[PDB]
């Protein structure tokens, strides 16, 4: 029986409870993404890595949900290597960043994929 640690296990939603993804794993997720036709895009954040409620507390308002867009949505990306190149760009650009890959399903106008790609030290 273990006690699940109350401290230091902050998650970043989808797939953040499996082991940290290998680049072949990253890649396959970016490939899936592309295989369904979803636009990749990168997002990143240097200071509020997790939801907070600074400006209002009414039902459903949270601050921290938006992150900064890293460059543009990669419209017509054809190989997932393009996406991965970008994560390696942002990490060297921003080693304090939290970086995540999102994917748009323009037609149903929903965002439909999300998973983190890089974290700062001790996260």
């Amino acid at each position: 029986m273990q006690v699940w640690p109350p401290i230091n296990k902050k998650k970043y939603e989808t797939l953040s409870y499996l082991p940290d993804l290998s680049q072949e794993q990253l890649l396959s997720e970016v490939e899936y993404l592309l295989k369904n036709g979803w636009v990749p895009c990168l997002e990143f954040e240097t200071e509020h890595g997790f939801v907070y409620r600074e400006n209002n507390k009414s039902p459903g308002y949270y601050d921290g949900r938006y992150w900064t867009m890293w460059k543009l949505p990669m419209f017509g990306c054809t190989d997932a290597t393009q996406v991965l190149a970008e994560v390696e760009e942002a990490k060297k650009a921003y080693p304090q960043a939290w970086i995540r890959i999102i994917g748009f399903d323009n037609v149903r106008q929903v965002q439909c994929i999300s998973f983190i790609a890089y974290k700062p030290e001790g996260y």
Binding site: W4, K10, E13, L18, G49, V51, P59, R108, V110
Partner: protein, 441 residues
């Protein structure tokens, strides 16, 4: 004859009903179908008005090739019979007196086609799938729910302890039991307060947004909105309502309040099987599901496919699509008797509950896919190390069924292996399916 008109060409602003009718002992389908139409519409000084403008028309008889006296009668009803925005008046006009008509033996309502000029008089979901995902920041994986048990009996501080524990483990939602309203052992406001405390604690801890369905069902319209108002006041994201015991009038009021105040509505189908179980009398659940998309809720209980045959599984997926999709074509295979255009009404996210266990994860991730809430009662809870690791158990199970699907692996086949290799890096998940190893592996 007057109410059996095979002549009829249906208007685009007509509500069509497919009723399975079983006549008596010497009553031709033609009279059955026409009595159904007469009785869900009109009768006399139609020389002071016009019978023909407001009459329900039985315009088709099929024979259900299989059973005895079963037919499928198709009735068409004028849009002018219906009060805009009142599911209460849709059901009172269609199912209000025909099921007790002595010349039929049993009658079941199988489908209703709701024309776009009546769908637009209804608000529908206060928010729907796309907004809910947005509001909550949860994308690419079914949302996980957890039942707090026992049903009745527990105290407010206790319920909140349960809730915190379960939520910090990885589920995104915890649920007020369908019948904890306000009782001698847990009055509502205390529950709401202690659970608002547990859910913010969990969220602060995890970093993910949490919610607890606070059940606002009450014995009066007033007491119900009073409860909703205090959940609004603690800034908490979702309340819940038992739409069928509560009633359609009251749930359209709670749904309008949620729209106007920003709260998600989770619905529970308590009492449905008094209405929808017998296959020859009653109203089929996809008609009760349709009336909730129109009355309004963001989540609704769709049942489980665990231990359901592929024939069942297909009627289930027929009405899950009626709940999430804008256009659903007629497909008598899965019971979709009518094509349905939803003219952009938001979709209701479906909740799969009861009997669900960790090892059922790949089947539910493949049968329901990403837009659903998978609800473990006994899963979360029944785990032996306690419910926060039973939550981890259930959360890694699911994030492995998702990763795998994205890697191209097939969940129908590799299921038991998927979960098996993920048990290797999670004592939580290991512990969770130790007896299942014994039978299976």
């Amino acid at each position: 004859l007057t109410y059996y008109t095979p002549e009829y060409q249906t208007k685009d602003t007509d509500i069509l009903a497919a009723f399975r009718v079983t006549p008596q002992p010497g009553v031709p389908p033609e009279e059955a179908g026409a009595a159904v139409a007469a009785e869900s519409s009109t009768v006399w000084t139609d020389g002071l008005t016009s019978l023909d403008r407001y009459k329900g028309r039985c315009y088709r008889i099929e024979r259900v090739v299989g059973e005895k006296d079963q037919y499928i009668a198709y009735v068409a009803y004028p849009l002018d019979l219906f009060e805009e925005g009142s599911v209460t008046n849709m059901f009172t006009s269609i199912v209000g007196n025909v099921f007790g008509f002595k010349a039929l033996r049993a009658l079941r309502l199988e489908d209703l086609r709701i024309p776009p000029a009546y769908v637009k008089t209804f608000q529908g979901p206060p928010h729907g799938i796309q907004v809910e995902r947005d509001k909550l920041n949860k994308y690419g994986r079914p949302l996980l729910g957890c039942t707090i048990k026992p049903k009745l009996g527990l105290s407010a501080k206790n319920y909140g302890r349960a809730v915190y524990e379960c939520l910090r483990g990885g589920l995104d939602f915890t649920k007020d039991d369908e019948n904890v309203n306000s009782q001698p052992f847990m009055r509502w406001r205390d529950r709401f307060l202690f659970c608002a405390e547990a859910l913010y604690k969990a969220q602060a801890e995890t970093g993910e947004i949490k919610g607890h369905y606070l059940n606002a069902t009450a014995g009066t319209c007033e007491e119900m909105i009073k409860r909703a108002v205090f959940a609004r006041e603690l800034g908490v994201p979702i309340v819940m309502h038992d739409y069928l015991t509560g009633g359609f009038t009251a749930n359209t009021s709670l749904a309008h309040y949620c729209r106007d105040n920003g709260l998600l509505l989770h619905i529970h189908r308590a009492m449905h099987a008094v209405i929808d179980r017998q296959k020859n009398h009653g109203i089929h659940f996809r008609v009760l599901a349709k009336a909730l998309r129109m009355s309004g809720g963001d989540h609704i209980h769709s049942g489980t496919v665990v231990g359901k045959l592929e024939g069942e599984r297909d009627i289930t997926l027929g009405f899950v699509d009626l709940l999430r999709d804008d256009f659903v074509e007629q497909d008598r295979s899965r019971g979709i008797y009518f094509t349905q255009d939803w003219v952009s009404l938001p979709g209701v996210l479906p909740v799969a509950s009861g009997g669900i266990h960790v090892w059922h994860m790949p089947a539910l991730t493949e049968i329901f896919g990403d837009d659903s809430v998978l609800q473990f009662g006994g899963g979360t809870l029944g785990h032996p190390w306690g419910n926060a690791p039973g939550a981890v158990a259930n959360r890694v199970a699911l994030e492995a069924c998702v990763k795998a699907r994205n890697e191209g692996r097939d969940l129908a086949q590799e299921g038991n292996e998927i979960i098996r290799e993920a048990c290797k890096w999670s004592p939580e998940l290991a512990a969770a399916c130790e007896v299942w190893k014994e039978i299976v592996f």
